[PDB]
Symmetry: C2
Subunit: 332 residues, 2 copies
Amino acid sequence: MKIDIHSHILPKEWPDLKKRFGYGGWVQLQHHSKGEAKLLKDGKVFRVVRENCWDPEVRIREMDQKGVTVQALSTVPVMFSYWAKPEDTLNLCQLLNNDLASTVVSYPRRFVGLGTLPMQAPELAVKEMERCVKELGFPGVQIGTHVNEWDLNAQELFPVYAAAERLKCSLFVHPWDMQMDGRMAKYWLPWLVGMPAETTIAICSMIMGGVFEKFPKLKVCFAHGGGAFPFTVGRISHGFSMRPDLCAQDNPMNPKKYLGSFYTDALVHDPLSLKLLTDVIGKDKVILGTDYPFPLGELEPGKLIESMEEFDEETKNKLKAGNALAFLGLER
Amino acid sequence: MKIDIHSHILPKEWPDLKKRFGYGGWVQLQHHSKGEAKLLKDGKVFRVVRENCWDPEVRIREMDQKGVTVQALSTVPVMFSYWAKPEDTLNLCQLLNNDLASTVVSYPRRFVGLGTLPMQAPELAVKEMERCVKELGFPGVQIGTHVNEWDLNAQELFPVYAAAERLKCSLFVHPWDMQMDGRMAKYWLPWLVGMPAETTIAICSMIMGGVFEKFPKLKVCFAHGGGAFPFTVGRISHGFSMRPDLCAQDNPMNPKKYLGSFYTDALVHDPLSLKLLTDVIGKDKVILGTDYPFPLGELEPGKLIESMEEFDEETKNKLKAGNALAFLGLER
Ligand SMILES: [Zn+2]
Ligand SMILES: [Zn+2]
């Protein structure tokens, strides 16, 4: 109920992409009757969205009802398209990034921009990042938990991290691209269970991969309370200690030592989980996030943090806003 | 430091299974240098185990040292063999359950048996359960978190649950046959992360699949504090409520209602995680588990429990023994 770090938005419309680029599997927007719209596989449909998902005035109203001062805006993670030709992803990223920037120009004290980047091609990613920060004025970028077969430990990605750290650019890591078929096709598991596992893998990849060691000024936030990590850190840490041969031939420091070194969003739904999240990650490093406007997110942003009779007013305020300005390097 | 619900043992020797069944993929134990054996799965040595993994005299000695009174013994999960022809698995289970039954009979005050079954052939698995419970006197069985393409919701598995329920045969679910390659082939991810995820999926499959509603008296314990479940139950519970088309099509109750309906082992490593586990699952439903003799387990069994200064004594003795006794259906 002050700043929402995790909020997704799309342009009203965009070019046909199977044409602009050639090949398929790209995602499009079809509005049938104003108020509602549909997201489409190329093949068959995969999400029914509302007016809030593209219309910034609709967004501000809802934000006024809900007490939300600013939303950090990123794209819908399905847009990442790390799987496609690189130069084509650079294109889409420019389109999405300029629309995002355009939305911030209309309401520069209600919105900020988290850019997107062609991560599968590190040096283009670097350039599109100098641009996001220095021309567009974005305070960070949103990226995926893994990039194809690369995980966030990859050496191929170190140039990007170096750049993030150079240009003071924050990173919001969003899980995406779980397994959808076979055992995971029922009960909404890729979302309910697959997303948290992707985030947990991402935190590990980075800690054990050397990233936080080789870039101590990097600002990283993970989605969904960082998945399973706050709860399974004990196991990850003890395992690092038992098999230094499987786990440390890349960075020798125990994962427990980077508690304090990264942020997570507070989208965990339960008070007991929120409490644990703050005891493990820290009161300074947890950030309110809503996943607005999707049904799986928090419906009353901050309602859970406000109900925590054990936090004091200072702590509730780091959670609703204070920690988020730190992470993005902004001022009130 | 009283009862250990989670512990594995192998026979010292077993026949060459390729020879016995006509095709490979099985594991063998080789004894080459002293106090040590190699497990090979067609090709490679994939694990080196010490004598405490097969020799009950040795286990008794370490139990004497650690203050453990009973270990509930089960085979190593790699032996589940759910992939083989249904007759051969059945043959192997009889060998392993007999070995198990022999160990137990030599020390029926220090061990209880958890048998193994040909899960991929539900009829064959009901007979072996009959035999484990009636002939062999085991209080329960150990099974995997999934059976090939089936998950714990599968209908074909239902006659098995009906058997266990009739027979007062407890179920101990252990994760296995998680992806080992690709992105999961570094930093021991399949064990640090993949295993907790497999168990979160199983708990989801059993709840949303109706299993606890169909069989209100089935008792089930899950390995490793139930994986990620206790921290991510909010997200599972909320998403269930948000998308009943995907989630409530088999069982109309929110997952939260099934808290208290199943057990988990206490193998979570940190006090904060333990405290959450019993806040969420309940003080009467967490069992001391150790994963002896593998190095990912608790090295000083009970020590995480005994260190917890918030728990009264009654609570500690529940987590150390009472809960295990209720879950197994036995007496002090
Ligand atoms: Zn999101
Ligand atoms: Zn185990």
